[PDB]
Amino acid sequence: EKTNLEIIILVETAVIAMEFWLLLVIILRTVKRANGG
Amino acid sequence: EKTNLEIIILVETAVIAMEFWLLLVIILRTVKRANGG
């Protein structure tokens, strides 16, 4: 079933976007944690 | 070429592991940032 792959690829994309979202997120949230006082 | 897929899957795995590594990392590093004084 090629479908699986089709998803494996689509997911991969959404993944990379996530990784950057995680760091960026934890980066923004954390950064604020500082001035959060 | 099925090779591509073979990689798309392998990567996916390493990916999920990363996502958890990012959060966990930024979680451990950040957590320390607190007691880091």
Side-chain angles (χ1 to χ4, degrees):
Chain A
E1 21 177 295
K2 197 154 60 36
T3 309
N4 234 18
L5 317 161
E6 302 248 294
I7 291 149
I8 297 157
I9 277 149
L10 286 190
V11 186
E12 270 222 278
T13 280
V15 144
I16 277 41
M18 296 148 16
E19 283 252 311
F20 183 59
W21 136 78
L22 290 190
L23 269 156
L24 198 153
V25 152
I26 315 151
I27 275 159
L28 269 163
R29 304 190 92 96
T30 286
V31 161
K32 279 164 197 179
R33 96 89 39 95
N35 84 68
Chain B
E1 24 177 295
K2 197 155 61 37
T3 309
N4 233 18
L5 317 161
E6 302 249 294
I7 291 149
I8 298 156
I9 277 149
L10 285 190
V11 186
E12 270 222 279
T13 280
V15 144
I16 277 41
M18 296 148 16
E19 283 252 311
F20 183 59
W21 136 78
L22 290 190
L23 269 156
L24 198 153
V25 152
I26 315 151
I27 275 159
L28 269 163
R29 304 190 92 96
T30 286
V31 161
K32 279 164 197 179
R33 96 89 39 95
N35 84 68

